[PDB]
Design a protein around this nucleic acid. Structure first.
Ligand SMILES: [Zn+2]
Ligand SMILES: [Zn+2]
Lengths: 643, 97, 97
DNA sequence: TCGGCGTGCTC
DNA sequence: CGGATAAGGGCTGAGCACGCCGA
DNA sequence: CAGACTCATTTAGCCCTTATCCG
């Protein structure tokens, strides 16, 4: 017979090979098969048939069959096929991305509310029931997770736990190991190849009970899967943006649906699409707001910035409040989503500003290292002494950064230690721990940091949270920027105060009368989420429609526009396409130049995702008629999180 | 001590008017482009200077100041508020080339 | 040729906002009061031309300015840039008493 | 006379 | 002291025989 | 006082290079 073999090649076609007599294969079995006259690569058998497009005598033979048993389970294989068809990616790459690295070369396969929620989850058993846990930060999400996991393990099944970042794995595996006598295992890119293969084998055998990992742990087969748990589903780490661009949450929901197992999504700030599904009765919500253990909510204040004597970006009222809080032996934390000393260097004579030729972006100034660094291509440049245009020597730093803030708050506070944490100062694993060790010592301290302050780290001695330079989320072209800013603000403000001490939050902005800020400050995140969801319902947005963006990169900004215009013409000239389909013309992306190559995009909008998928499949089948398809890098991104 | 020497080309058109007191007045804007020294490093200097000469007899040069490779004006300088001409020049000595 | 000679008192306290890689700068405003006389009538000279001192060579003389003192600053005239066009006209001091 | 760059295909 | 292993980086997440053009 | 919507943080290939542990 003839066996269809998929190979790690960016082509949406499965090659056909002839099996010599005496050898049989099944679906999803690795086969060592020659490919040309270069090397005998490793492929995966998709299906076996009797007829081929080419003559049977023309086909080649297979050297050896690595495995007599499919590496993927039936559910995993079905999910892989469905994802490959849905994301319009070549099947071979999709299949090989879900395999361990060692197996790719053919190596031997070898409270009252909490109780009610737990009872409801237990009652809804042996059925595909998707649940969403929403509550204030600091609630008993981990307690509910432990309860549902022990209830599932009572039947002897397994469990899967997903976290957005690697750094959060120890803080939860410690609790899981303490509570549960059953073995647990981790699986992420941080581990070595042998450890990942051992985790894969243990999950397949079924000896391991709980598998904890990032989005790459979703493809691990399980002997008997009982429940899938997703923590912090709104994080952007679940969406891959390189190679195969899938979303972990959607694939996990599909896996739960196919296997008919409960799935629990927990997040303090649920995503807009999750809330839309909740409104659409697709999900079931559970609100566990219990004051996070009799903890008083923080006090929110808005301070006008116009017409104020700002000292290093701080208002006098903010300075007085910080001094008052520090006098009471309590730490203070300041949020500034910037890096370096100055975001740009400006000439005082002619207005010249240093700009990266490869990015069309202003260089960022670092004073400790004394150089100009680009934050988009990591280019290294020295600090200029004279302006290249006019020759003046009056270059002045402009803008505010964390390094400048740390430098300039030293004179204001005489005996208050200053601690700064960001990506620049956290290049070493031990560096993070010692800086967190200093914070845990208590006393008085000022913390300056980027959004790294919103991670799993919890500071029990901080009472005041101040946000600086929050502008940019109110005048952005992106429609998702407000949601992201609200999620970040809720995460940062949720850490203010403690059970005993009352927290205070101060926001500095030039537009205190903006409806967004007022709604987010004087009302909870849920009210803003509902208002934004209704507003998007009034418009046509991805929470209520389907968006597919075809990005194209050009080395000389010449072939991408014409290629995208031809693609748009093919999209419009198709019987599958209807009037309701909305396709935007070729326009530059939010970043017209990122790595020396221009970027252009096409946005496709349709109320139904299945119709859009059919249209895209037809167009992809019709791509071969488009000339000059080479020398242009283009990808398809389904449901983008940016742009 | 208040004096200025400046060399530059003319800009726009040289307006010539007669004051009610009988002293002719000429107003024009000078374009300057030169390189000077600043902290030991050479850099270019440029500015636009309106010149309002109020001479009577020695201002005969103004008849041929519309075209000139090098126009040099020397004398007193003083500026003033304008509630958009803030920096003005009203020297008397004018030299060509 | 761009050279300006001026004398007067100081209006605003000097500022010492330093620049990256050294090369400090001095920011202060000069106040000048004098009179001008010629054939026919007399003129008045008064405004607030700013003066800029750059480089570490002249740093030792920028001291003891305080708020008001009779000083003479020599140098050329150059313009600046801002959101309101020229928006000012500073003086690049070369020789200081 | 010889190296650098733009195409199909591999079952 | 040699083998095996852990940590870090730099472009790339398909590539080679073939034919054409400039040096 | 001098730029506007941003920025900034995150996980996951691949071959080549460098430094470290163990028998
Ligand atoms: Zn300049
Ligand atoms: Zn760059």
């Amino acid at each position: 017979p003839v066996a269809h073999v998929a190979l790690p090649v960016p082509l949406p076609r499965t090659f056909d090979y002839l099996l010599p007599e005496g050898m049989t294969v099944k679906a999803g079995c690795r086969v060592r098969v020659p490919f040309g006259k270069q090397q005998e690569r490793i492929g995966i058998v998709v299906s076996v048939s009797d007829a081929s497009e080419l003559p049977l005598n023309e086909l080649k033979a297979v050297v050896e069959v690595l495995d007599s048993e499919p590496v993927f389970t039936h559910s995993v294989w079905r999910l892989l096929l469905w994802a490959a068809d849905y994301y319009h990616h070549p099947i071979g790459d999709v299949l090989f991305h879900a395999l361990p690295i060692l197996l790719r070369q053919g190596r031997p396969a070898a409270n009252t509310e909490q109780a009610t929620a737990v009872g409801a989850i237990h009652s809804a058993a042996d059925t595909f029931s998707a649940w969403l846990l929403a509550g204030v930060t600091g609630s008993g999400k981990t307690e509910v997770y432990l309860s549902v996991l022990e209830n599932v393990l009572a039947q002897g099944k397994q469990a899967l736990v997903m976290v957005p970042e690697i750094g959060l794995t120890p803080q939860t595996i410690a609790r899981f190991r303490e509570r549960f006598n059953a073995p647990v295992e981790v699986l992420h890119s941080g581990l070595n190849d042998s450890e990942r293969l051992s985790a894969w084998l243990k999950a397949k055998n079924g000896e391991a009970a709980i598998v904890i990992g990032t989005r790459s742990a979703l493809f691990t087969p399980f002997k008997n899967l009982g429940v899938i748990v997703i923590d912090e589903e709104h994080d952007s780490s679940y969406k891959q943006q390189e190679g195969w661009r899938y979303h972990a949450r959607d694939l996990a929901v599909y896996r739960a649906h196919s296997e008919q197992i409960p799935i629990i999504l927990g997040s303090a700030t649920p995503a807009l699409e999750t809330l839309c599904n909740v409104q659409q009765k697709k999900y079931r919500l559970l609100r566990l707001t219990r004051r996070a253990g009799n903890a008083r909510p923080a006090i929110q204040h808005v301070l006008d910035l116009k017409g104020q004597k700002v000292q290093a970006g701080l208002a006098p009222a903010l300075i007085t409040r910080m001094r008052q809080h520090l006098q009471a032996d309590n730490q203070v934390i300041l949020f500034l989503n910037r890096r370096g000393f100055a975001p740009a260097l400006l000439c005082h004579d002619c207005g010249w500003i240093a700009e990266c030729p490869r990015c069309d972006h202003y260089y960022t100034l670092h004073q400790a290292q004394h150089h100009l660094r680009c934050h988009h291509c990591d280019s290294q440049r020295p600090v200029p002494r004279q302006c290249p245009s006019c020759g003046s020597t009056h270059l002045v730093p402009v803008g505010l950064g964390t390094e400048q803030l740390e430098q300039t708050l030293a004179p204001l506070f005489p005996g208050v230690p200053i601690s700064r944490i960001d990506r620049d100062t956290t290049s070493r694993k031990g560096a993070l721990e010692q800086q967190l060790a200093e914070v845990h010592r208590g006393g008085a301290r000022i913390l300056i940091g980027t959004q790294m302050l919103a991670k799993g780290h919890h500071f029990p001695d901080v009472t005041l949270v101040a946000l600086l330079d929050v502008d940019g989320a109110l005048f952005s072209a992106d429609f998702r920027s407000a949601e992201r800013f609200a999620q970040l603000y809720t995460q940062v403000a949720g850490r203010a105060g403690r059970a005993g001490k009352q927290g205070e939050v101060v926001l500095q902005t030039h537009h205190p009368e903006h409806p967004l800020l007022q709604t987010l400050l004087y009302k909870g995140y849920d009210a803003f989420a509902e208002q934004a969801l209704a507003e998007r319902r009034m418009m046509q947005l991805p929470p209520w429609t389907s968006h597919v963006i075809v990005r194209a990169e050009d080395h000389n900004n010449q072939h991408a526009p014409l290629f995208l215009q031809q693609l748009r013409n093919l999209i419009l000239s198709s019987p599958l396409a209807d009037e309701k389909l909305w396709v935007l013309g070729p326009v530059p992306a939010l970043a017209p130049k990122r790595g020396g190559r221009w970027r252009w995009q096409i946005l496709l909008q349709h109320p139904s995702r299945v119709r859009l998928q059919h249209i895209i499949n037809g167009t992809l089948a019709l791509i071969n008629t488009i000339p000059d398809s080479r020398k242009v890098k283009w990808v398809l991104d389904v449901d983008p999180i940016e742009g | 001590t208040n004096r200025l020497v400046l060399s530059g080309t003319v800009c726009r058109a040289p307006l010539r008017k007669v004051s009610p007191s009988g002293i002719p007045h000429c107003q024009f804007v000078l374009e300057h482009r030169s390189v000077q020294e600043e902290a030991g490093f050479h850099r270019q200097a440029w500015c636009q200077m309106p010149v309002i000469v109020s001479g009577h007899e020695n201002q005969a040069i103004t008849h041929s100041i519309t075209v000139g490779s090098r126009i040099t004006v020397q004398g007193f300088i003083s500026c003033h508020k304008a509630k958009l001409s803030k920096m003005v020049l009203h020297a008397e000595q004018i030299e060509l080339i």
